[PDB]
Amino acid sequence: MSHHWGYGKHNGPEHWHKDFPIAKGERQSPVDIDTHTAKYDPSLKPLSVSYDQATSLRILNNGHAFNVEFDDSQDKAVLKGGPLDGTYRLIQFHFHWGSLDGQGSEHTVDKKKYAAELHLVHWNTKYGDFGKAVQQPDGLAVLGIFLKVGSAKPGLQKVVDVLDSIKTKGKSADFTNFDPRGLLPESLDYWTYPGSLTTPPLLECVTWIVLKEPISVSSEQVLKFRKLNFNGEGEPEELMVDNWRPAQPLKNRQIKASFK
Ligand SMILES: Cc1cc(=O)oc2cc(C(F)(F)S(N)(=O)=O)ccc12
Ligand SMILES: [Zn+2]
């Protein structure tokens, strides 16, 4: 209730370390993925994305981004395999995007920034609940998917059209029966490394799995994202753009590739 961090000039990523010292930690995210240095790991098991039974419930503008929330009271939508040991349950997805197509993603590929990045957040069921999971090194698994501007993503339109109803901070809307499988690219080839949440509290509890294949969304679709507001209703308009944290030092970590 007393957090004041954001993405503006005076409360942006370069200021976060004051209230959250872990911002300068040993396994912070996002990071630049240097494709020539990432090594193929033949030991990585196949990635398993089982979203057939996913049950979305609501979409919320939290003043930073918008979250599409799922019912995670049961083992429906889960992520397993890949670098993961155990079962991770989908709790929500959100995006990070820019003010222009040339920036917006958190992770970068050989320093290339994509227009946006989708994050599907999952928590390790061995810890019982999300709050307990974020206190563990292997508590979360976040699946990251890059977005580039070109052809429209049919599966994203239902999200785009509901944004008018959650323009400002604190607004939410019913959002049932949304199928996240419609946001995935064809290939599940990925890079993986141990990291953190990319907004405060910046906890170092995430196994990052970033897909190599980006999805394409249309200019009209991303333009709608850019019409959202960071501010609450009745306050001066601050367009919700550039809600991404820049790449952090890789330090003592190796990024592994699931493909050759
Ligand atoms: C506390 C928490 C709960 C949750 O369901 O999702 C989150 C997502 C993020 C993130 F958006 F910053 S990221 N990018 O690290 O996923 C940060 C914190 C949470
Ligand atoms: Zn995120």
Author numbering: 1 to 125, 127 to 261
What's the publication's text?
Carbonic anhydrases (CAs; EC 4.2.1.1) are widespread metalloenzymes which catalyze the reversible hydration of carbon dioxide (CO2 + H2O ⇆ HCO3− +H+). Here we report the crystallographic structures of hCA II in complex with two aliphatic sulfonamides incorporating coumarin rings, which showed a good inhibition and selectivity for this isoform.
The crystal structures of hCA II in complex with compounds 1 and 2 were determined to resolutions of 1.67 Å and 1.56 Å, respectively. As generally observed for other hCAIs containing the sulfonamide moiety, in both adducts the inhibitor binds to the enzyme active site coordinating the catalytic zinc ion through the ionized sulfonamide NH- group and forming further hydrogen bond interactions with Thr199 residue. Instead, in these compounds the coumarin ring contributes to the stabilization of the complex by means of numerous van der Waals interactions with the side chains of several residues delimiting the active site cavity. Interestingly, even if compounds 1 and 2 differ only by two atoms (two fluorine atoms instead of two hydrogens), their arrangement in the enzyme active site is significantly different. In particular, the two coumarin rings present a different orientation and the ZBG in compound 2 is shifted a little bit more deeply inside the catalytic cavity.
